[PDB]
């Protein structure tokens, strides 16, 4: 039973590539899929990939067996600064599993209770920042989330202050980011990437990179002339050996991987935030039961480890604001063989997928009818979830290695909001999602009433 | 008997006025003394003033029976947004004397104690913010000064907090009010004020004017609004009744009150802190000796009243700052009725009179040959210092209100700062004092080391 996929219309010789000049492909491409389906085709000049949104269909699309990361076509403009690091790496490059075995450790428990105390750091100036707003003033909530979580990942990976909550802007690094990810996202639909009208976003893409080089340099030059004994990422970074090849990482494969990390290790993380905090506010009950478990476990001016492994609610919200808006929304395969995907649609070797998470994590044979309500109570038990329903952090080997420094991070920082504030939506805020190939509340802000409780 | 003036050199008709035609018109003033002596007549269209600079001359103009405040054409430029509060009131005025009786008990021993909590949580914000450095990174010292000091204002005084260290650029308050000082100090030399040259300069004047008046505003309305109590600056402002006619201040006098208190308490304090910290790095035999006492009594990690009265020799550093930099540098008098001046100069009813309190604070027949030296030893014994020797603060019924406040803030932050780190010139730095009518050091940085004494 071979059927023929649908696909979204065209435009004569550029297929459907300018379905992408939007500012919001992700949602475009959602939009899409609520009108074919489970899988459509989607073509551009020199290209075709499948876009999937069941269930039924990705499921197989993780069987490792049959299916590898692919390099979507983000990933290989963002691989422009990102070089072989982890994210942009193929499986089958060398120092793809020499780089997983030798920073595999520095996610360990040991290795999380070691971050736990910085991660504190950070979080303590998130609340004092909060403490300190005057009568109705408010809270730019991505703004202050992305300063989180930036300097987390830079103070618990790095040993390095971005110190964003000294400043009224973005850090320089943030502001490069964005703008080489804007530039990716962009570089996306264009058909003649060649052409001179785009010297300028060339140009321009360059001196981004050289910002956030040359933040990288500075990280690496303090570490070597540092007279502090660390053990965090970077240690690992230029101390491990991978029992493997018995190598460290060179020095261009570090620079690649700082860069990774820090955009990696931050960017999707406030976006968690961002969409957490706005799905408690529109959801009081939901949010009453957050800040009660807070109240219980967080009976310390300071959390514990120990004590925000005791957050399990905490970690439902988390889960529930990661399915409804999963912050890097896609990821892409290819075929290792020939194979037929769900017994209708044959793939040959090499044939490449889209994973639309946010679509697979609505797809209603799973979650039932109630699918766009905020429930944190569907993660109460994994085992009555089925396979690959839900794959906010990715796949197999090629999963996210900073999944559990994320949760923390995001468990520890929401806990401590909800201990001290109450926190309320005064514009009835319309919730607007700016891509920049991630996923993040664009214009979501509220204000916080302090629970006057000591830190 | 009767002398004649000296006068420095003419410009024709402009007479003296284009020796104000320049940055740094205070320090031209003082080369001036220096050429000319205890006395010079100064004139320009219109205006005649005599400039004193001996404690010989200087304590007859401190006496009260022979002359009053006189209002600079600095202050009457000020006035265009400080109105008849306090600093630029006539003493004839009665809002001088009511607001001076509503307020003088806001600067009460007892006030002191209940100011101090706030002034160390603004103090605790300056000492983490240069914890938190990265290895090599330096401050810039009246920057991060003026963040300080505005900060405390608005906290002790009208609870509400600026956040100046939760921003990389100046407050917009802050560039408003230099803005205006800027133009004020401009405008002195100014023949030709009508002159279409300088619509924009008026233009800007008036929006920076508006600037510091919405700030106040939201002071105002965020008071209102309080359901906390408090008691404070403004609360005397808005409840406190003069006991001499009974009545509170009015609407449009508290306005003025709260402009002239936010920039009145911080500029010159801002400066006094700068210019304390650029005399102790130049001269570490002093340092060594202020940072001894400010280890050895601030024993705990937050100062206490009593402690920071304990820092004799850190209030000894300040007053040797104010005596060779005093902040506010010149003050003006005018002659109460026909009178002679030191048996030599006869004055006529009306006739005014300038300060020029650094070469008052130079005159070497009180201090002694070594007066360019930085000595804090010269105040160890407080009674052997001549009367109307040393005015930092003015004089008499005029003269600064927020003395005690000024050093009380200062001490505990110079002595948290010698406390917590070792600080290094590490440009040897020249040297470069700002004139907006008050006097800053400009460009001034240094690096610190932290001592790791825990907060
Ligand atoms: C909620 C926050 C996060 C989400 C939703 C997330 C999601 C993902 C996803 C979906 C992938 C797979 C990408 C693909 O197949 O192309 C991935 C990979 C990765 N993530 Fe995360 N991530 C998060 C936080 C982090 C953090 C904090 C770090 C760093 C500490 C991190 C480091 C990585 C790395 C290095 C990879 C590449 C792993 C490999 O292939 O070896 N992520 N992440
Ligand atoms: C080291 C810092 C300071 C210096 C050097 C200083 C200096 C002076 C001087 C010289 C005067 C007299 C001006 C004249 O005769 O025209 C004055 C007046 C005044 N100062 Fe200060 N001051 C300082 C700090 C402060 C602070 C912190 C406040 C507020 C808390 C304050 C509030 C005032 C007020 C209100 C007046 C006018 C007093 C009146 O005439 O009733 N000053 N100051
Ligand atoms: C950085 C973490 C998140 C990355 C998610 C990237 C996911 N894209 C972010 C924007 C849209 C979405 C996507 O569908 N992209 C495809 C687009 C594409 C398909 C076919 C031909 C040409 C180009 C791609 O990049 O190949
Ligand atoms: C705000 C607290 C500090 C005030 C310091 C004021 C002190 N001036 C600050 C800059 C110079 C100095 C001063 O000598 N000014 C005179 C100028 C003047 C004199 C005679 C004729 C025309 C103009 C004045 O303003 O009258
Ligand atoms: C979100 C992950 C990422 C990793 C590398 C480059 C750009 C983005
Ligand atoms: C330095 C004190 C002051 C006071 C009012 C206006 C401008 C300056």
Redesign the interface.
């Known amino acids: 039973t071979i059927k023929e996929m649908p696909q979204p219309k065209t435009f004569g010789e550029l297929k459907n590539l300018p379905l992408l000049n939007t500012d919001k492909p992700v949602q475009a491409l959602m939009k899409i899929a609520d009108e074919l389906g489970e899988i459509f085709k989607f073509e551009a000049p020199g290209r075709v990939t499948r876009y999937l949104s069941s269930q039924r269909l990705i499921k197989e699309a993780c069987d490792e067996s049959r299916f590898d990361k692919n390099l979507s076509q983000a990933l290989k403009f963002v691989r422009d600064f990102a070089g072989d690091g982890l994210f942009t790496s193929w499986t089958h490059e060398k120092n793809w599993k020499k780089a997983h075995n030798i920073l595999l450790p520095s996610f360990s428990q040991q290795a999380m209770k070691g971050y736990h105390a910085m991660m504190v750091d950070i979080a303590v100036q998130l609340v004092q920042?909060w403490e300190?707003?005057?009568?109705?003033e408010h809270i730019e909530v991505p703004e202050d989330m992305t300063r989180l979580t930036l300097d987390t990942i830079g103070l618990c990976g790095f040993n390095?202050?971005f110190?964003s909550?000294?400043?009224?802007?973005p850090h320089p690094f943030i502001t490069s980011m964005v703008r080489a990810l804007d530039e990716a996202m962009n570089k996306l639909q264009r058909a003649n990437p060649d052409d001179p009208a785009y010297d300028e976003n060339k140009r321009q893409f360059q001196e981004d990179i050289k910002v956030m080089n040359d933040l990288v340099d500075?990280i690496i030059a303090?570490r070597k002339?540092?007279g502090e004994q660390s053990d965090d990422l970077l240690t690992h970074m230029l101390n491990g050996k991978d029992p493997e090849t018995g190598e460290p990482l060179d020095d261009e494969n570090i620079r690649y991987q700082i860069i990774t990390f820090l955009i990696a290790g931050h960017e999707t993380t406030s976006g968690l935030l961002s969409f957490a905090l706005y799905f408690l506010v529109k959801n009081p009950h939901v949010l009453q039961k957050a800040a009660e478990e807070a109240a219980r476990v967080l009976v310390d001016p300071v959390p514990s480890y120990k004590q925000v492994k005791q957050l399990k609610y905490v970690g439902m919200v988390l889960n529930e604001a990661l399915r409804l808006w999963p912050t890097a929304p896609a990821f892409s395969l290819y075929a290792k063989e020939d194979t037929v995907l769900g017994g209708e649609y044959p793939l040959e070797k090499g044939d490449e997928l889209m994973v639309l998470i946010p679509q697979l994590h609505r797809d209603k044979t799973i979650w039932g009818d109630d699918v766009e309500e905020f429930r944190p109570e569907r993660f109460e038990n994994p085992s009555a979830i089925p396979q690959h329903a839900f794959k906010p952090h990715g796949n197999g080997q090629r999963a996210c290695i900073g999944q559990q420094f994320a949760l923390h991070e995001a468990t520890l920082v929401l806990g401590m909001m909800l201990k001290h504030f109450d926190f309320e939506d005064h514009t009835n805020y319309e919730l607007d999602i700016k891509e920049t190939l991630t996923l993040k509340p664009e214009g979501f802000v509220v204000k916080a009433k302090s629970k006057k409780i000591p830190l």
Chains 1, 2 share one sequence.
């Open positions: 920042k300190r707003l005057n009568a109705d390095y202050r110190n909550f000294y400043r009224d802007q500075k303090d002339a540092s």
